[PDB]
Amino acid sequence: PLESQYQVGPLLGSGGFGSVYSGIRVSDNLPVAIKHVEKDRISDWGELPNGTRVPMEVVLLKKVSSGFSGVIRLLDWFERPDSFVLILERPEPVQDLFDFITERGALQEELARSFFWQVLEAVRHCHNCGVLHRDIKDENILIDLNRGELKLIDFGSGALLKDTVYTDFDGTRVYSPPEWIRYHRYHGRSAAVWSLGILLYDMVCGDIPFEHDEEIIRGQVFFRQRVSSECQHLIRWCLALRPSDRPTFEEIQNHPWMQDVLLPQETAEIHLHS
Numbered sequence: 001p002l003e004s005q006y007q008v009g010p011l012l013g014s015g016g017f018g019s020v021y022s023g024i025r026v027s028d029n030l031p032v033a034i035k036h037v038e039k040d041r042i043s044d045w046g047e048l049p050n051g052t053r054v055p056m057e058v059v060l061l062k063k064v065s066s067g068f069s070g071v072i073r074l075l076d077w078f079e080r081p082d083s084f085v086l087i088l089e090r091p092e093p094v095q096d097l098f099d100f101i102t103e104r105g106a107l108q109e110e111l112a113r114s115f116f117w118q119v120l121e122a123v124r125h126c127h128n129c130g131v132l133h134r135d136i137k138d139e140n141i142l143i144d145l146n147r148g149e150l151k152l153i154d155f156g157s158g159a160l161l162k163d164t165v166y167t168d169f170d171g172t173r174v175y176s177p178p179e180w181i182r183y184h185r186y187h188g189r190s191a192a193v194w195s196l197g198i199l200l201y202d203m204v205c206g207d208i209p210f211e212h213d214e215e216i217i218r219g220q221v222f223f224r225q226r227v228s229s230e231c232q233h234l235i236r237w238c239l240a241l242r243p244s245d246r247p248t249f250e251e252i253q254n255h256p257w258m259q260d261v262l263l264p265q266e267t268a269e270i271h272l273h274s
């Protein structure tokens with residue numbers, strides 16, 4: 001009885017993830033996001049202990065919905081004849097990180113450090129729950145502007161984390177690593193670290209470093225904005241051409257550029273005027 005449990009509001013967006021509407025849980029006036037996907041547009045199917053074929057995204061989301069505030073949590077889902085409907089939390093006010101960077105340009109390094117740190121904590125949480133996101137990027141990251149907390153979204157290209165090689169990929173190509181472009185082979189963690197390198201560059205430069213396949217493959221990073229040497233070093237480390245030359249999450253978070261991060265609420269007070 002989806003329409004009796006939730007009040008539907010404006011359309012907030014549409015895209016490869018489907019169509020997302022603002023919503024309110026009639027029970028307790030909780031703000032929610034109501035996301036619709038057509039069955040014929042689902043790229044990858046998975047399934048639950050009961051038998052029911054569902055979008056892979058529902059499998060992954062249930063594994064990472066633990067009360068952690070770094071992933072947008074799945075509250076409920078419904079199956080319709082031709083679509084699935086997902087009920088997700090919705091911070092208020094909220095802004096997508098892609099739009100935030102569009103509006104403000106290159107971020108101050110103190111702000112980028114806090115944002116990057118929170119993205120790492122959230123990706124580590126996903127991996128600890130057995131989930132590989134495979135589409136880390138600014139469009140798939142929300143800012144809870146009052147609390148200064150970032151939240152990951154869109155597991156529709158994800159997979160169960162495994163230790164063997166992946167030979168399939170359906171995320172964003174300009175965030176994909178060179179070993180995928182050249183060989184159509186990657187391992188989950190080092191591919192995630194590559195995409196975190198692209199993301200960090202995007203935050204401190206205001207745009208992604210590579211647009212074309214041969215730029216990804218060549219792996220030469222040019223900085224068009226003034227960026228500290230420690231940040232440049234971390235970025236180039238994450239964008240190492242050989243997967244085994246890339247840092248681990250532990251190595252990223254111990255890097256000199258990552259030290260003395262602001263807490264999320266401090267971040268909101270200094271930088272989000274909140």
Ligand SMILES: Cn1c(-c2ccc(N3CCNCC3)cc2)c(-c2ccc(CO)cc2)c2c(Cl)ccnc21
Pocket residue numbers: 012013014015017020033035072088089090091094095096098099139142153
């Ligand atoms: C998918 N999704 C979005 C979302 C909404 C819109 C977009 N796009 C895609 C391109 N950038 C502008 C619009 C991307 C994501 C949002 C989202 C909602 C509101 C706003 C800002 O009003 C931004 C993103 C969202 C929330 Cl809150 C929970 C769960 N999923 C969500």
